[PDB]
Amino acid sequence: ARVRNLNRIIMGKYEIEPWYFSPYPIELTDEDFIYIDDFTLQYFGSKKQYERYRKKCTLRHPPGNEIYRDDYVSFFEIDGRKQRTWCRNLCLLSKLFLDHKTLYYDVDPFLFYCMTRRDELGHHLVGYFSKEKESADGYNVACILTLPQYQRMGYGKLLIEFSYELSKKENKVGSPEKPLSDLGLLSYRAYWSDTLITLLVEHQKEITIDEISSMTSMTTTDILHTAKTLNILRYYKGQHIIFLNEDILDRYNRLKAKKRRTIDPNRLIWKPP
Numbered sequence: 038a039r040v041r042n043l044n045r046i047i048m049g050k051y052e053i054e055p056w057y058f059s060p061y062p063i064e065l066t067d068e069d070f071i072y073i074d075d076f077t078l079q080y081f082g083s084k085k086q087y088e089r090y091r092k093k094c095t096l097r098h099p100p101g102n103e104i105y106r107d108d109y110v111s112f113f114e115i116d117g118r119k120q121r122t123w124c125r126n127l128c129l130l131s132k133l134f135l136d137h138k139t140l141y142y143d144v145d146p147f148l149f150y151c152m153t154r155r156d157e158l159g160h161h162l163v164g165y166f167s168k169e170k171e172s173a174d175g176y177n178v179a180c181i182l183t184l185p186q187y188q189r190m191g192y193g194k195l196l197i198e199f200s201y202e203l204s205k206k207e208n209k210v211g212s213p214e215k216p217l218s219d220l221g222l223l224s225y226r227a228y229w230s231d232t233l234i235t236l237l238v239e240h241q242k243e244i245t246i247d248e249i250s251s252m253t254s255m256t257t258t259d260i261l262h263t264a265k266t267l268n269i270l271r272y273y274k275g276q277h278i279i280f281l282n283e284d285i286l287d288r289y290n291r292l293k294a295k296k297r298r299t300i301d302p303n304r305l306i307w308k309p310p
């Protein structure tokens with residue numbers, strides 16, 4: 038009698054192996070897989086069951102308001118309390134790739150911003166980031182995730198950039214919840230670096246900390262840490278600034294050479310509560 042662990046999830050054409058254990062309320066059997074509907078995120082122990090529900094009539098995108106939509110991606114804002122089932126399913130899926138995550142069942146305190154890529158086939162959920170409706174620490178991101186099958190395609194940086202656009206619209210600085218996984222922290226460091234580098238080349242050769250946080254919603258701490266890492270911190274005109282140098286120009290051009298997609302602030306149709 039085999040009592041197997043969940044060793045693989047079948048999502049669309051993808052067969053993904055979890056990185057960590059997730060509390061799916063499922064029976065342990067001699068099989069080690071479950072089906073995850075790429076639209077509803079519902080889990081099924083049998084292909085037959087999955088098929089049975091797949092036929093049902095359902096929207097083909099996350100259950101929320103589309104507050105951002107460009108030719109590349111869309112962002113749906115979902116209130117956990119309004120979509121408990123879907124969000125709980127999202128959290129169970131997310132935990133498979135997180136060392137730790139708050140109780141998956143309690144989604145009420147969060148707002149989920151799910152990003153989809155649109156094809157000739159429609160919407161495809163590629164990642165998301167949750168956010169406390171009320172954060173005592175002012176965290177502008179609780180958890181963030183790019184589904185495994187879509188990682189290392191630039192989606193994570195888009196998720197992060199979007200979280201800062203919300204903060205900017207809110208007239209507040211923000212920073213991701215600590216502690217961050219290594220993957221998460223390294224992604225933020227790259228984003229913060231790319232951001233200061235782009236500002237120095239496209240905005241001004243010299244910029245004060247205040248100006249930076251005002252334009253990016255990045256906190257003083259994240260700005261200083263990033264500036265020190267790049268060796269671009271100085272004192273000019275009576276205050277601390279970051280400055281441009283050949284290294285930064287080089288980095289900027291290399292960044293641009295990759296012709297990466299970015300978020301257009303003008304397409305964010307959203308008002309904070």
Ligand SMILES: CC(C)(COP(=O)(O)OP(=O)(O)OC[C@H]1O[C@@H](n2cnc3c(N)ncnc32)[C@H](O)[C@@H]1OP(=O)(O)O)[C@@H](O)C(=O)NCCC(=O)NCCS
Nearest residue numbers: 134181182183188189190191192193194217218220221224
């Ligand atoms: C952290 C996380 C969101 C990052 O998401 P992601 O989608 O992989 O992020 P990005 O793709 O924007 O990261 C940039 C990387 O992708 C690579 N990349 C992006 N587009 C690419 C392309 N078209 N071709 C080749 N490489 C590409 C970049 O070269 C870069 O590699 P590097 O970091 O070694 O320099 C993701 O690793 C994840 O969900 N991890 C598990 C959950 C987790 O730990 N979350 C954070 C909790 S604190």
Ligand code: NA
Nearest residue numbers: 179180181221
């Ligand atoms: Na996180």
